[PDB]
Design a protein around this ligand. Sequence first.
Ligand SMILES: O=c1ccn([C@@H]2O[C@H](COP(=O)(O)OP(=O)(O)O)[C@@H](O)[C@H]2O)c(=O)[nH]1
Ligand SMILES: OC[C@H]1O[C@@H](O)[C@H](O)[C@@H](O)[C@H]1O
Ligand SMILES: [Mn+2]
Length: 274
Amino acid sequence: FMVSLPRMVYPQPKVLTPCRKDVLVVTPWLAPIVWEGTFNIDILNEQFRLQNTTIGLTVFAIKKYVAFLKLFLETAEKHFMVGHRVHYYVFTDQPAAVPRVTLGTGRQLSVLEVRAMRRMEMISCERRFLSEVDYLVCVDVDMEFRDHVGVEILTPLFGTLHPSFYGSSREAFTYERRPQSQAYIPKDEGDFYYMGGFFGGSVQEVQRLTRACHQAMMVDQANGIEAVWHDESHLNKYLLRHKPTKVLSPEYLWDQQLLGWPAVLRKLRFTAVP
Ligand SMILES: O=c1ccn([C@@H]2O[C@H](COP(=O)(O)OP(=O)(O)O)[C@@H](O)[C@H]2O)c(=O)[nH]1
Ligand SMILES: OC[C@H]1O[C@@H](O)[C@H](O)[C@@H](O)[C@H]1O
Ligand SMILES: [Mn+2]
């Protein structure tokens, strides 16, 4: 049950004025593609706080990657779902190397020790996530938040446009192209190339995705084949056959050193560390 929004004063949306004319802002299966200028974050924050939303954020920091956690978490605290309840789950082989980062109120961190592709299996923590959070966001650790990443991304299932391919035709996508792999996608198929480093959704839809990618990876292992881009190839296969309900623009996963700051990106929200 969703209670009424309170009165709010904001600019009227005008039907004969698009928000953004330069980019596609809805997919052909009617999923929003999330760019700056397409959402009023005050309306969204109301909607999600009225449901007392809790967001889980998973990150793996194995071996040398523990070095990235301090900047990742400190910038998450500045930019990720601020005002909402957040539970970080840090999966690592070195619990004692997790930095002590001060968190804002309503935010918690759990360190989950693992042994040093297996992210999909490890995510598919099933029971715990179902009890503890409403949505799961699953990202790479060698990154930093530079600007707002908030509830505009939440939906039952989302992927993120890979920043090297958002302008590419499908035949250039680096999907797995060998029919012997579960991740295979023919040259005349594909909507987008999604980045393995940022996907998420409701806990149920994320457990479906990560279970299906884990099973498909195990089939490929039994068959002696490893997909060209590992879990990212399987995530692409899954999202072609199970369309996401939102797609995040490359504002949400960018590399300024490699790609600069094109005009089409009004904000660079989550970016690779040099
Ligand atoms: O030795 C490793 C290799 C990978 N990762 C985790 O797996 C993610 C994906 O690997 P990586 O970021 O190296 O892929 P890239 O983005 O460079 O292609 C890393 O962000 C970490 O989040 C890790 O923790 N330790
Ligand atoms: O072609 C796909 C690849 O593109 C790279 O730019 C990225 O570093 C890789 O992790 C993989 O996503
Ligand atoms: Mn990475």
